[PDB]
Design a protein around this ligand. Structure first.
Ligand SMILES: [Cl-]
Ligand SMILES: [Cl-]
Ligand SMILES: [Cl-]
Ligand SMILES: [Cl-]
Ligand SMILES: [Fe+3]
Ligand SMILES: [Mg+2]
Ligand SMILES: [Mg+2]
Ligand SMILES: [Mg+2]
Lengths: 211, 197
């Protein structure tokens, strides 16, 4: 999904709000802040209501202005609440009644997702690969800066996982694939307009093709 | 035009979500409190610091950490949520590694701790992939241009830690002394371990 969450390479932001080794304060800065992750795990591990990938995708589905003005942990409050409503576990009525006011949620999905690709290639360390020049409206774990770009494999994982574009929609056809550390030259991704060396993206097999 | 939607206070919304689930019996007794304790007390960059100090003083462990990070971490019992498939990346005299999750905040929680606000900021997520040298410089870390900067974007299930170079002036230090200078920011890759003058 080509949403505002796909921020890598966006220009115009200011300084990162940190200097190295500065005091970052407690893990949680407010008494509610442990709730979104804890309730995500209740939904994933205890209720079996959704996957972690569905949590990433429901946050990607926040209305874009809402995403841009919402602090990090609050996006997950909104995202887990939305999934609980979409899965029929909670109603928005009851959330707003308990909250004492408005509790707007992420927008509905405009894609049913897609299955794990039927045809893929096992790649080897050192092989040149290109990221498939594909556009996916639902969840995908490919940041747009690498779409269509060429890099070299530095690692093929020794485990396999469900394809995000399927499990992020709660589909039954996510299968399992390994992922690949693909090293791109900075210039491949950003031309002359970068001060970096290389960027390594961890890409599912189904996002790649031989170069 | 472009205005924020009306919202109840975020604390009210977060506790409403807890109460709506809890009041249906869907949240086991002590469940969120258990997670809060895990997140605050167990998931910690002191663990990644212990792994670095061991690698720095034990060539065999160093090799294991760099070839099978998961197995190395498992020896210490530090695998966990968002930390089940670990790759450690080695800094060298010509290479500085730095980690981000441009799409959200993915981090090797059990050995780095939960990510700090700054790592999850739009500023870091947008900028470090494209201008890591300027970002690190602004943050207080100068990387000379005889060094390639390599940014790992945490886009799938690999969870990374940086194994920084060991600074001169620490020869013979104990593992506890070395651990003290491996900070959270050294594990993420934005800082280089500092030796007192
Ligand atoms: Cl609170
Ligand atoms: Cl250019
Ligand atoms: Cl292919
Ligand atoms: Cl070294
Ligand atoms: Fe993330
Ligand atoms: Mg985009
Ligand atoms: Mg209404
Ligand atoms: Mg001594």
């Amino acid at each position: 999904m080509d949403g505002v969450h796909d921020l890598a390479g966006v220009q115009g932001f200011g300084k990162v709000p940190h200097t190295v080794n500065a005091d970052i304060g407690p893990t949680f800065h407010a008494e509610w802040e442990h709730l979104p992750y804890s309730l995500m795990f209740a939904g994933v591990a205890e209720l079996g209501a959704f996957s972690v990938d569905e949590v990433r995708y429901v946050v990607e589905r926040m209305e874009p202005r809402h995403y841009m003005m919402t602090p990090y942990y609050e996006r997950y409050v909104i995202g887990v609440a939305t999934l609980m409503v979409e899965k029929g576990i909670l109603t928005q009525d009851e959330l707003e009644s308990l909250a004492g006011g408005p509790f707007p949620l992420s927008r509905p999905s405009e894609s049913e997702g897609r299955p794990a690709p039927v045809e893929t290639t096992t790649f080897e360390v050192g092989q040149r690969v290109r990221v498939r020049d594909e556009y996916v409206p639902g969840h995908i774990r490919m940041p747009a800066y690498c779409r269509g770009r060429v890099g070299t494999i530095s690692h093929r994982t020794t485990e396999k996982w469900p394809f995000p574009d399927a499990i992020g929609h709660g589909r039954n056809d996510a299968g399992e694939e390994p992922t690949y550390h693909v090293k791109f030259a900075a210039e491949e991704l950003f031309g002359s307009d970068t001060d970096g060396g290389s960027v390594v993206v961890d890409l599912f097999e189904g996002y790649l093709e031989p170069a | 035009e472009n205005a924020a939607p009306a919202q109840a206070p975020v604390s009210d919304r977060a506790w409403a979500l807890f109460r709506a689930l809890d009041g249906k019996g869907l949240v086991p007794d002590g469940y969120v409190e258990g997670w809060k304790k895990t997140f605050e007390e167990d998931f910690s960059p002191r663990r990644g610091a212990e792994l670095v100090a061991r690698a720095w003083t034990d060539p065999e462990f160093r090799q294991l950490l760099l070839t099978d990070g998961t197995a190395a971490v498992a020896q210490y019992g530090y695998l966990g949520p968002q930390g089940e498939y670990i790759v450690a990346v080695e800094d060298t005299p010509t290479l500085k590694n730095v980690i981000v999750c441009s799409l959200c905040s993915c981090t090797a929680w059990p050995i780095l701790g939960l990510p700090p606000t700054w790592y999850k900021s739009f500023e870091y997520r947008a900028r470090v992939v494209r201008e890591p040298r300027k970002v690190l410089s602004e943050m207080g870390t100068e990387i000379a241009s005889d060094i390639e900067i390599r940014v790992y974007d945490t886009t799938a299930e690999t969870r990374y830690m940086v194994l920084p170079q060991r600074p001169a002036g620490t020869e013979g230090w104990s593992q506890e002394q070395l651990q003290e200078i491996v900070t959270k920011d050294c594990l993420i890759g934005v800082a280089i371990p500092q030796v007192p003058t």
